Amino acid sequence: EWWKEAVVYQIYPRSFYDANGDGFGDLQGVIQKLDYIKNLGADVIWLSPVFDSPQDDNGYDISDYKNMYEKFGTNEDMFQLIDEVHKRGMKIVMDLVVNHTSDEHAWFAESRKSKDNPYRDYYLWKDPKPDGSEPNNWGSIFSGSAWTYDEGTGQYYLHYFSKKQPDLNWENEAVRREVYDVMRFWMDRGVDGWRMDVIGSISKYTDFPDYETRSYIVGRYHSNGPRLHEFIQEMNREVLSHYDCMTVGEANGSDIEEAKKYTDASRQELNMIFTFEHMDIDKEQNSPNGKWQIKPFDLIALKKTMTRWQTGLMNVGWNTLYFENHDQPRVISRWGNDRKLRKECAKAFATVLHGMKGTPFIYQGEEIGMVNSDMPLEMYDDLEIKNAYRELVVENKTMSEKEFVKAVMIKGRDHARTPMQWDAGKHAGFTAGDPWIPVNSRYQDINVKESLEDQDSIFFYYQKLIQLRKQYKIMIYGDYQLLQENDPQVFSYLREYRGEKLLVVVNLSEEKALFEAPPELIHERWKVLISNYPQERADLKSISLKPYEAVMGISI
Ligand SMILES: OC[C@H]1NC[C@H](O)[C@@H](O)[C@@H]1O
């Protein structure tokens, strides 16, 4: 169970480091930056997908599971990376993307040819309605219908994501066997585990029932299908049980009850899952604009949600801890201050997360406080934006252009995908060429070089949080109790382990706040383990908190 004690660094490789100068981050670039990641202190790297792919969804549309996309390199580069990771005592986790393939995968190129093609049932084909329309009213996560018509065979195929991402038919045992072969191919070559892309979607309701009623709907049927956990238990039996591996499922649609199904060790499924419930607190529940209908940051909602996951998986299963990935904006821009208080704010969110029970995930650039971009809408790359613009602004007019732009400036996935900022030179030192997407305009002030030269950097704060997790067993194995539950500024909680107490107090606001210890804790003596402000005190019975002040103390 080394995965319980791990800290994971997530790499989005096309934006991490470009070794050959074409503006596209590559595998040799990752290799050159492994020493940086090890010095930070992560011991597991999760690579977003580098498999061959036409890049309709930047690698999450896979056309060959057993070869690299040309701009990342060759399998020989991938094998070298695996060796270089292991040489440094680290582990490498790959992205398993098996809810769907590219429509340019050989399986689909065969499948679509005819209803009697041997690969026809590798995907999900349905007749039109009598009037020619789609089999049902299901929507794609990237706007529009979940179905696309094939003129040649007169049937629609299903895609929860883009039209170039047809969903695999997991009802077909041959499909499941192909997936397990891919897993064994890579695990036999040293891959230490898998992050499983939208694993909550692999089981469908084969009736494809309409949602109740907007033309296209995404809801309860898009995840948690009737055979989901049967399939994952099979995957464990056939593959995962045969390897010393780590698994994290990207569990779309997960609540805390579903998380127990996924992560209870006695169920022999996965080690941990990503949920979206803490990421969902700033969208309206059921707007036609989905994620783009933004609500202000609500700390009470964050506290209640994260607390439900800490208590729900306190003594069974295991949590993941994240605020950032390649699908989320920079958290300090989204929910905090990314200007005069950027360093304090970045360290505050880091303290909230890393003081909890679970496996922390650091997204590339989070550890230096990277921020959202001011680039104009036409410089965004993500197909999600182009498609939502068409549906929400042009066709349905449920958002004005101005409000859509404002929402994309807060939540667009490309705020995670601008190049990693290594120094204040050209293109922040990401590339000698022309980057595939613009470098954030603030890179001269925010970059790895200045971070390593500044003892007060966010980077060294993250490095210390990781050191503390390795030093203080209470951080890995202590229980969890929310304090000051209804305080709208202060996120405070207590971990307990073998008579020790860990107190975490974080002001997640720009204004002065007040922490008062619960009365039974007022006479404890504390050693401050970390704070984003200087501390010289052993009593924490009341703390007058400055903007974004974070304190972590251990009882003595
Ligand atoms: O594969 C579809 C979808 N799954 C979730 C991934 O994190 C996201 O980047 C991708 O677009």
Numbering used by the authors: 3 to 215, 219 to 561
Give the published text.
Here we experimentally determine the value for ΔCP‡ from the temperature dependence of the rate in the absence of enzyme denaturation for two quite different enzymes: the small, dimeric ketosteroid isomerase (KSI) and the large, monomeric α-glucosidase MalL.
This leads to a negative ΔCP‡ value of –11.6 ± 0.4 kJ mol−1 K−1. MalL samples a larger conformational space than KSI, occupying and regularly switching between a number of structural clusters along the simulation trajectories, related primarily to changes in loops surrounding the active site. Analogous to the ligand bound chain of KSI, the catalytic half of the TIM barrel increases in CP at the TS, while more remote protein components, including the second TIM half barrel contribute to the overall negative ΔCP‡. Analysis of the contributions to these differences show that negative contributions to ΔCP‡ are dispersed throughout the protein and arise from auxiliary domains (MalL) and dimeric units (KSI) not directly involved with the reaction chemistry.
